[PDB]
Design a protein around this ligand. Structure first.
Ligand SMILES: c1ccc(CNc2ncnc3[nH]cnc23)cc1
Lengths: 20, 337
């Protein structure tokens, strides 16, 4: 499922901003 | 009347924008308690103002780190804008000052924690729960955009939940006052509009795309474009192929298709009717806009608070002691702060 793919991803924690 | 409210709000903003408050407190007036959240330039700490007994959230920026990261102008934008704005869903800046080493922004303490924490724990919000939050973002952006401000960092991490279960927008590090188009590559990978990824000149419509990402994430429990690496997220966004959970209402999907519109001539918030295309959309039919602004709508979720100064709605962070150099650093870079 998409939920299981999200939960197993490395992007479920607080996401950092990007710049420049 | 919205036009009338906004014109008066603009008069108020312009006076503070043209004549900014500066050096309104000193570090030794606050007792440092605990770190509420972190960043590239320092931290946001729970503090206690000794004279009043009030608790505040103090953002600390190391001037040398700001300079190294080429965030000087963005930092000056953050403080200049925050001290000038006034809206129920924007965190108040109580004080600002600087010392030899750092920049300080003392803001209203929001004890309920980040929307991010509650969303990840619970999994997803129901459509009425998501609609309640989305409505507050819609009004906040209508207010910011009317003042020529682009927010550029919408995400659950930056949305705090107050004692009344209402949103307080925090972190103005990418906020900018712009009448035309702008070019800076900034924001969060999952929330970036295709215009930003494609190094095009962009405007306020990027905030409306970010609103589409937020509504989707609150109602699905995961964002519409995710992958392990930002480059893979960018490929998904530029295609803009969006798949919706089966549980999303037909009205929710229609709103999201208009918000996550790669074509700027078709994006809601960007058309001739502006924000009204969003506010009058079927998914918002049950929303009383005036009652949202007035905070008279009952919140679907009220956080727990075990008295003043409690931090349990926030994660724990490693503490680093504040060192203030004997020598002034980056004086000229930050003179207007
Ligand atoms: C980035 C996003 C969120 C946080 C947590 N801030 C925060 N927490 C509590 N009260 C506040 N008022 C002003 N800001 C805050 C820190 C960094």
């Amino acid at each position: 499922t998409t939920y299981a793919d999200f939960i197993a991803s490395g992007r479920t924690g607080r996401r950092n901003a990007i710049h420049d | 009347s919205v036009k009338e409210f906004l014109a008066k709000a603009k008069e108020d903003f312009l006076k503070k924008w043209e004549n900014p408050a500066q050096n309104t407190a000193h570090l030794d007036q606050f007792e440092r308690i605990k770190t509420l959240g972190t960043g590239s330039f320092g931290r946001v700490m729970l503090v206690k103002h000794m004279e009043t007994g009030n608790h505040y959230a103090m953002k600390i920026l190391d001037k040398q780190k700001v300079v190294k990261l080429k965030q000087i102008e963005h930092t000056l934008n953050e403080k200049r804008i925050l001290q000038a704005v006034n809206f129920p869903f924007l965190v108040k800046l109580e004080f600002s000052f600087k010392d030899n080493s750092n920049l300080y922004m003392v803001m209203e303490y929001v004890p309920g924690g980040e929307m991010f924490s509650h969303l990840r724990r619970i999994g997803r919000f129901s459509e009425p729960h998501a609609r309640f939050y989305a409505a507050q973002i819609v009004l906040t952006f209508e207010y910011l955009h009317s003042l020529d401000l682009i927010y550029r960092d919408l995400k659950p991490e930056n949305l705090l939940i107050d004692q009344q279960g209402y949103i307080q927008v925090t972190d103005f590090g990418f906020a900018k006052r712009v009448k035309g188009r702008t070019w800076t590559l900034c924001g969060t990978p999952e929330y970036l509009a295709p215009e930003i990824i494609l190094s095009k000149g962009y405007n306020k419509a990027v905030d409306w795309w970010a609103l589409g990402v937020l509504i989707y994430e609150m109602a699905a429990g995961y964002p519409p474009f995710f992958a392990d690496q930002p480059i893979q997220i960018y490929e998904k966004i530029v295609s803009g192929k969006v798949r919706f959970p089966s549980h999303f209402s037909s009205d929710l999907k229609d709103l999201l298709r208009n918000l996550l519109q790669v074509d700027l001539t078709k994006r809601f918030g960007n058309l001739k009717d502006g924000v009204n295309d969003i506010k009058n959309h079927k998914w918002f039919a049950t929303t009383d806009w005036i009652a949202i602004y007035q905070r008279k709508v009952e919140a679907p979720f009220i956080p727990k608070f075990k008295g003043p100064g409690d931090t349990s709605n926030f994660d724990d962070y490693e503490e680093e002691e504040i060192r203030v150099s004997i020598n002034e650093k980056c004086g000229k870079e930050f003179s207007e702060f």
